């Protein structure tokens, strides 16, 4: 599919905050797509990047990489104080079925909302 | 048998039932306080975005009202009736 | 883990500082909620924390914090919406209400 | 918190799959927990590893790493026991500044959780079609 | 003493099943006894070995269990994998009777404790 | 899992006595747990060690019991003799759950059989 | 014992401030337990760490180490300004009795509230 | 302040023990005070040492160090005088920033004092059982 | 003979007695001001969380009231009646 206004609802603490996004072109150099929020500041925008990696003669392994980054706002023109970014990398073999990849993706999505992970992330309590 | 549905993120929350108990719809772990299991042991359905009480022992101490109250994310910032 | 509060306010005046109090039995506290009763309807929460004043209410109420005792202060009664008020905590696993006006 | 059995509901593309995870202790060499499927030969489970990391002389920011493995076993024609053929890794690593509150971390976690159900990501994963 | 058919029962993960043991005579080479089950082909046969030694004493008990699968090429079954086990008691010539029996009793009652039944059922080390 | 105070009871030659165990934390050097009894001086202290390994698996459980006498010259008690014990399970990565549990069950129930209680109580080898 | 909500009352200047704590898991690498306060900030939390050290082939000496650290808050997202941390290390020999260790601990606890130490700490007047 | 006799009440596990400390001056080599038991041979007392430290070219933060020693003497069977056999050290070191007020220091001191009576610490000390 | 008990941290404080004296319950070091030792020399018990005056010389200048006042940590922030 192409890039459209990816909208997310019922998100965050208390499960009420919503987030809208807009396409921001595709960089053809490294084959990376980019998203952003509607704020009019180049360095205070939520950014979502997705990409693939066709197998080369040096890798022979499909790679799907999704990155997220959120900056912070502090007024002292507001500046950026803290970065908080996360990376997701999938690896698939040439003979990976559709069922296998979909299963991996959706079980990661479901397990990411499990109480173990929310206590391992929000309060950083080791398992 | 009481039931209610909402419009927020039904999963990743709690469903408070007090005139008693609360449930997390995903990986349902119930909590009982006040009395014993009593009359108000409860279940939850994540697919239908609702929670149910079967309300056994239909004798008279279940008379007036039960309020469906919403709790969000375990620890703080909850009880959004 | 019961709490106590002063009942029967019955303040018919406009300028009031009755300041309903909720006496915490245990010494933990640190998490108190205030509820109001509509005469013929449901209920809506006032302050989720001690005194941060959840939105949807005029900037005229404050849940005071003090040693082993908490109170809710009104600036001046608007002669309406004053029938019943509730106070409750959630710091301990068995939660409970607070009976009284 | 403590390790217990973790149940996952409504899995797979069709939405009707079940996965059950049992705790497998924490490795004291590096401090990484683990999980595993209920009944399987110890070479054919579905490993799920979680871990945190406090700052040191380097990497002053916090770090959370999650690795999962999904080996697929095909029984060789006329063979004794099944052998592992393919792999499907998936690495999820976070990064948090010491002063970052819980709000930002929770927002990142839930945004990542919700993205994996957006049409863009499911298409880019199932058929591997870029933007 | 005298090796005799010992029938220990009510064992197994379910606990319902039981097995019988048949003496197979000590060999003069190293004074090591042998016990076994006469149910099946000698290659696919559960074996128990107990060897009380002489001088500090050493009492060593080894139990092993073979499991087999029907290879397609050869009609006869073959051993696929072998599940060893080892118990090696030790003592001093001045050690009394009750102090000796304490080790055996604690080892017998600890394998029935959840701590080792979990550490030996799913191979998860204690944390 | 999580080491917790395990209280195995009704053991001993008479069988009336019992002991309690206190966790003492795993060391990072070799991933070996430790359990103990807090009753007495640390030198004169019963010790239990369980060490689940990683790859064919190895599960090794060691229990040792020290006994002391009051030396006339020195006021402090000293260790006189040390009663070792060793259990060394082994497995293959393809071994299932029930086949694993069979070894543990048979070893637990065989130490209660007369054959080994006699061979480990009075150090008389089987004939 | 295990980790629970360690609560402390009647603490501090004027003897009225109270402090609650929550468990935050046990790091298995260095065998260190950790505690924390209920604040939702990873770098503005009171931290209590306790641990032991089983004797190695290089130490031969029991070590119990308890650490405390308290940060400060200053608003200019609030930042950290001053650190104020303290360390307690006990050393015990293998034949240390229970009476001896308990006596050392409790007399340290009592002497830590003596007027000499309060004037040596709060105002840092040398003795 | 000034050194005097320091009396300690309600000591030991049973809560019925008494310890009396007499001043022993301050060592001018490094500026460390000392204390001692009332009546004992100078090789068998219960040394208690306290000291402070002002900043220098290094260690810009304040520092307080407390060391205590509890030797235990067993009379050798058929011997002239008792000999020291075992030791029990206990080192307590603080650290304070120059700008730190008295409130924080007092809070740290009283929290450390109260912790040593919590069930966790008494168990971890008497029987040496970790968490 | 007057006595009173409290609910705060009884140790590490002072117990003021003025219509005169004060005591630190641990390592009791008394303080006398105003008159001489007089009638109000005092003691303290840390175990029972209370302080006592025996009030010798029972003649008439001890008539109306004595107030039990609480002082905290020597120097500042005290007199919490």
Chain B residues with CB under 8 Å of A13 CB are 72-73, 77
CA angle G54, E56, E33 (to 5 degrees): 110
Distant-in-sequence, close-in-space partners of A39: CB < 8 Å, separation ≥ 6: A45
Nearest-Cα distance to chain F for H81, in Å, is: 13
Provide the resolution (angstroms).
4.0
Q: Where are the alpha helices (DSSP H) in chain F?
A: 97-110, 114-121
Nearest-Cα distance to chain E for D81, in Å, is: 8
Q: Which of F46, F60, F51, F48 is nearest to F29 (CA)?
A: F51
* Element containing residue C50 per DSSP (H, E): none
d(CA D86, CA F65): 49
Helix%, strand%, coil% for chain F, nearest 5: 15, 25, 55
CB within 8 Å: G9 and C28: no
Distance of CA A36 to the CA centre of its chain: 11
Token pair of G38 as six digits: 């209920």
d(CA E112, CA E95): 26
Token pair of B49 as six digits: 């975005």
Q: Which of D8, H77, G100, A4 is nearest to F40 (CA)?
A: G100
- Using DSSP's 3-state secondary structure scheme, residue E118 falls into helix
d(CA I79, CA I60): 28
Cα-Cα end-to-end distance for chain G:
38
Q: Which of F2, F27, F93 sits opposite D43 (nearest CB)?
A: F93
d(CA G27, CA H13): 30
* Element containing residue C15 per DSSP (H, E): none
Distant-in-sequence, close-in-space partners of A42: CB < 8 Å, separation ≥ 6: none
Token pair of E105 as six digits: 């009793």
Helix%, strand%, coil% for chain I, nearest 5: 0, 30, 70
d(CA G114, CA H2): 13
Token pair of B46 as six digits: 């994540």
Tell me how crowded residue I16 is: count the other CB atoms within 10 A of its CB. 20
Chain G nearest-CA residue for A123 = G40
d(CA E91, CA F82): 7
Q: Give contacts of G 48-107 with C, CB under 8 A.
A: none
Q: Which residues in chain H are immediately followed by a break of C to N over 2.5 Å?
A: none
Chain A residues with CB under 8 Å of B11 CB are 113
Pairing mode, if any, of strands H19-27 and A22-27? unpaired
Q: Which of G30, G51, G94 sits opposite F42 (nearest CB)?
A: G94
Q: Which neighbouring-strand residues pair with E61?
A: E50, E87
Q: Which of A11, A101, A106 sits opposite D111 (nearest CB)?
A: A11
Q: For the range H4-8, what are the long-range contacts, defined as Cβ-Cβ under 8 Å and sequence gap of 24 or more?
A: H6/G111, H6/G114, H6/G116, H6/H35, H6/I27, H7/I27, H8/G107, H8/G110, H8/G111, H8/G114
For chain F, the farthest-separated pair of C-alpha atoms sits apart, in whole angstroms, at 58
d(CA D24, CA D45): 12
Q: Does D24 touch chain E (CB under 8 A)?
A: yes
Pairing mode, if any, of strands H83-86 and H72-74? antiparallel
d(CA A81, CA G75): 14
Q: Give contacts of H 45-104 with F, CB under 8 A.
A: 74-78, 85-86
Token pair of I72 as six digits: 């905290």
Q: Which of F83, F88, F122 sits opposite E103 (nearest CB)?
A: F83
- Using DSSP's 3-state secondary structure scheme, residue E121 falls into helix
Chain D nearest-CA residue for F26 = D28
CB distance C60 to C76 below 8 Å: yes
Distant-in-sequence, close-in-space partners of A77: CB < 8 Å, separation ≥ 6: none
Residue D1 belongs to domain spanning = 1-131
Tell me how crowded residue H57 is: count the other CB atoms within 10 A of its CB. 5
Q: Report how far apart, in Å, the C-alpha atoms of G88 and of each of G13, G50, G71, H66, H95 are.
A: 22, 10, 18, 9, 12
Q: Where are the alpha helices (DSSP H) in E10-96?
A: none
CB within 8 Å: G31 and F27: yes
CB distance B25 to A15 below 8 Å: no
CB distance H85 to H75 below 8 Å: no
Q: Which of G29, G41, G80 sits opposite D101 (nearest CB)?
A: G41
d(CA H130, CA F27): 12
d(CA C39, CA A54): 67
CA angle H104, H105, H111 (to 5 degrees): 85
* Residue D104: CATH number of its domain: 3.30.380.10
Tell me how crowded residue C59 is: count the other CB atoms within 10 A of its CB. 7
Token pair of G103 as six digits: 């006596």
Distance of CA D34 to the CA centre of its chain: 10
- Using DSSP's 3-state secondary structure scheme, residue D44 falls into coil
Which residues of chain A have a Cβ shorter than 8 Å from any chain B Cβ? 10-11, 13-16, 113-115, 118
CB distance E107 to F40 below 8 Å: no
Chain D residues with CB under 8 Å of F52 CB are 25
CB within 8 Å: G113 and I77: no
Which DSSP category does A15 fall into?
A: G
Chain I nearest-CA residue for G16 = I8
d(CA A110, CA D100): 25
d(CA F110, CA A17): 63
Q: Which of G24, G42, G77 sits opposite A74 (nearest CB)?
A: G77
Token pair of A127 as six digits: 């398992």
Distance of CA C72 to the CA centre of its chain: 5
Q: Does B76 touch chain C (CB under 8 A)?
A: yes
> Technique behind this structure?
cryo-EM
What is the number of domains present in chain G?
1
Chain H residues with CB under 8 Å of I47 CB are 10
Chain F residues with CB under 8 Å of H75 CB are 75
* Element containing residue I73 per DSSP (H, E): none
Q: Which of G73, I33, E120, D20 is nearest to A107 (CA)?
A: D20
Tell me how crowded residue B58 is: count the other CB atoms within 10 A of its CB. 7
Nearest-Cα distance to chain D for G3, in Å, is: 11
d(CA C74, CA C15): 9
Nearest-Cα distance to chain G for F18, in Å, is: 20
Nearest-Cα distance to chain B for A73, in Å, is: 23
CB distance E38 to E23 below 8 Å: no
Q: Which of G84, G55, G54 is nearest to G67 (CA)?
A: G84
d(CA A35, CA D111): 14
Q: Which of G13, I9, G20 is nearest to C30 (CA)?
A: G20
Phi and psi at residue E116, in whole multiples of 5°? -90, -25
Which DSSP category does I13 fall into?
A: S
Q: Which of E64, E63, E61 is nearest to E90 (CA)?
A: E61
- Using DSSP's 3-state secondary structure scheme, residue F10 falls into coil
- Using DSSP's 3-state secondary structure scheme, residue E127 falls into coil
The residue ranges of DSSP E strands in chain G, in sequence order, are 7-11, 17-20, 22-27, 32-36, 47-51, 62-71, 83-92
Token pair of B47 as six digits: 């697919």
The residue ranges of DSSP E strands in chain B, in sequence order, are 2-5, 14-18, 21-22, 31-32, 42-45, 50-53, 67-71
* Element containing residue A26 per DSSP (H, E): strand A22-27
d(CA G22, CA F43): 34
Pairing mode, if any, of strands D6-8 and C43-45? unpaired
d(CA G21, CA G7): 6
Q: Does B47 touch chain D (CB under 8 A)?
A: yes
d(CA H93, CA G89): 9
d(CA E34, CA E88): 16
Q: Which of E116, E25, E87 is nearest to F111 (CA)?
A: E87
Chain D nearest-CA residue for B28 = D7
Nearest-Cα distance to chain E for D74, in Å, is: 17
d(CA H110, CA I13): 13
CB within 8 Å: C27 and G20: no
Q: Does G124 touch chain H (CB under 8 A)?
A: yes
Distant-in-sequence, close-in-space partners of H46: CB < 8 Å, separation ≥ 6: H19, H21, H36, H37, H68, H69, H70, H71
Give the number of beta-carbon pairs within 8 Å between D and G. 28
Q: Which of E72, E73, E125 sits opposite D25 (nearest CB)?
A: E125
Q: Which of G14, G16, G113 sits opposite I26 (nearest CB)?
A: G113
d(CA A31, CA A64): 11
Tell me how crowded residue D45 is: count the other CB atoms within 10 A of its CB. 20
Which DSSP category does H30 fall into?
A: T
Which of G21, G28, G77 to substitute to test the interface with A, most A CBs within 10 Å?
A: G77
Chain I residues with CB under 8 Å of G114 CB are 26-27
CA angle F70, F73, F76 (to 5 degrees): 50
d(CA D91, CA A87): 8
d(CA A47, CA E90): 66
Q: Which residues in chain A are immediately followed by a break of C to N over 2.5 Å?
A: 76
Q: Report how far apart, in Å, the C-alpha atoms of F73 and of each of E94, F78, H75 are.
A: 21, 11, 9
CB distance G33 to G50 below 8 Å: yes
d(CA A118, CA D22): 18
Q: Chains touching chain H at 3 or more Cβ pairs under 8 angstroms?
A: F, G, I
C56 backbone φψ class: left, alpha, beta (φ>0; ψ -120 to 50): left
Q: Report how far apart, in Å, the C-alpha atoms of B1 and of each of B4, B42, B52 are.
A: 11, 10, 7
Pairing mode, if any, of strands A47-51 and A62-71? antiparallel
Q: Which of A72, A74, A124 sits opposite G42 (nearest CB)?
A: A124
CB within 8 Å: F107 and E85: yes
Distant-in-sequence, close-in-space partners of D73: CB < 8 Å, separation ≥ 6: D44, D82, D83, D84, D85
CB within 8 Å: D6 and B73: no
Q: Report how far apart, in Å, the C-alpha atoms of A59 and of each of A43, A53, A65 are.
A: 34, 10, 15
CB distance I56 to I37 below 8 Å: no
Q: Which of D30, D67, D73, D70 is nearest to D50 (CA)?
A: D67
d(CA A83, CA F104): 52
CB within 8 Å: C45 and B79: yes
CB within 8 Å: F26 and G31: yes
CB within 8 Å: H13 and G112: no
Burial G75-112 (b: 16+ CB within 10 A, else e): eeeeeeebebebebebbbbebbbbebbbbbbbbbbbbb
The residue count for chain H: 131
Q: Report how far apart, in Å, the C-alpha atoms of G86 and of each of E8, E54, F51, G91, I19 are.
A: 59, 57, 35, 17, 43
Which of I73, I76, I79 to substitute to test the interface with G, most G CBs within 10 Å?
A: I73
- Residue identified by tokens 């064992």 is E11
CB distance G72 to H104 below 8 Å: yes
Q: Which of G10, G13, G118 sits opposite I8 (nearest CB)?
A: G10
* Element containing residue D102 per DSSP (H, E): helix D102-115
Chain A residues with CB under 8 Å of D119 CB are 1
Q: Which neighbouring-strand residues pair with A85?
A: A69
d(CA B18, CA C97): 9
CA angle F99, F102, F104 (to 5 degrees): 125
Chain H nearest-CA residue for I27 = H7
Distant-in-sequence, close-in-space partners of I79: CB < 8 Å, separation ≥ 6: I16, I69, I70, I71
Tell me how crowded residue D91 is: count the other CB atoms within 10 A of its CB. 15
Phi and psi at residue F119, in whole multiples of 5°? -75, -15
Q: Which residues in chain G are immediately followed by a break of C to N over 2.5 Å?
A: 76
Q: Report how far apart, in Å, the C-alpha atoms of A92 and of each of A109, D65, D126, I11 are.
A: 17, 19, 11, 67
Q: Does E39 touch chain F (CB under 8 A)?
A: no
Q: Report how far apart, in Å, the C-alpha atoms of B73 and of each of A16, C29, D97, D110, H55 are.
A: 11, 20, 23, 12, 48
Which residues of chain D have a Cβ shorter than 8 Å from any chain B Cβ? 6-7, 9-10, 106, 110
Token pair of F95 as six digits: 């071994």
Q: Which of I12, I27, I46 sits opposite H7 (nearest CB)?
A: I27
Q: Report how far apart, in Å, the C-alpha atoms of H36 and of each of G113, G125, H16 are.
A: 18, 21, 20
């Amino acid at each position: 599919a192409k890039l459209e206004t990816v909208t997310l609802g019922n998100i965050g603490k208390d499960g009420k905050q919503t987030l809208v996004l807009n396409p921001r072109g595709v960089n053809p150099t490294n084959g990376v797509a980019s998203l952003s929020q509607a704020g009019a500041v180049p360095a205070l925008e939520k950014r979502v990047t997705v990409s693939v990696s066709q197998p080369s003669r040096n890798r022979k392994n499909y790679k799907v990489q999704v990155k997220i980054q959120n900056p912070t706002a502090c007024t002292a023109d507001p500046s950026v104080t803290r970065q908080a970014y996360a990376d997701v990398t999938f690896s698939f073999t040439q003979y990976s079925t559709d069922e296998e990849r979909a299963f991996v993706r959706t079980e990661l999505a479901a397990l990411l909302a499990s109480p173990l992970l929310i206590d391992a992330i929000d309060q950083l309590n080791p398992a | 048998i009481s039931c209610k549905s909402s419009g927020y993120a039904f999963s990743s929350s709690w469903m408070n039932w007090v005139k008693i108990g609360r449930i997390y719809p995903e990986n349902g772990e119930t909590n009982y306080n006040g009395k014993f299991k009593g009359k108000a042991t409860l279940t939850a359905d994540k697919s239908s975005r609702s929670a149910y009480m079967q309300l056994n022992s239909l004798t008279s101490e279940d008379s007036a009202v039960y309020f469906c109250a919403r709790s969000g994310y375990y620890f703080s910032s909850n009880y959004d009736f | 883990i019961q709490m106590t509060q002063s009942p029967s306010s019955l303040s018919a005046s406009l300028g009031e500082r009755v300041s309903l109090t909720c006496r915490a039995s245990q010494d933990i506290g640190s998490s108190l909620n205030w509820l109001q009763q509509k005469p013929d309807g449901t209920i809506k929460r006032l302050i989720y924390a001690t005194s941060n004043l959840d939105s949807g209410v005029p900037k005229r109420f404050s849940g005071s914090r003090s040693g082993s005792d908490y109170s809710l202060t009104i600036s001046s009664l608007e002669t309406e919406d004053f029938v019943d008020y509730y106070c409750l905590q959630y710091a301990t696993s068995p939660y409970t209400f607070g009976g009284g006006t």
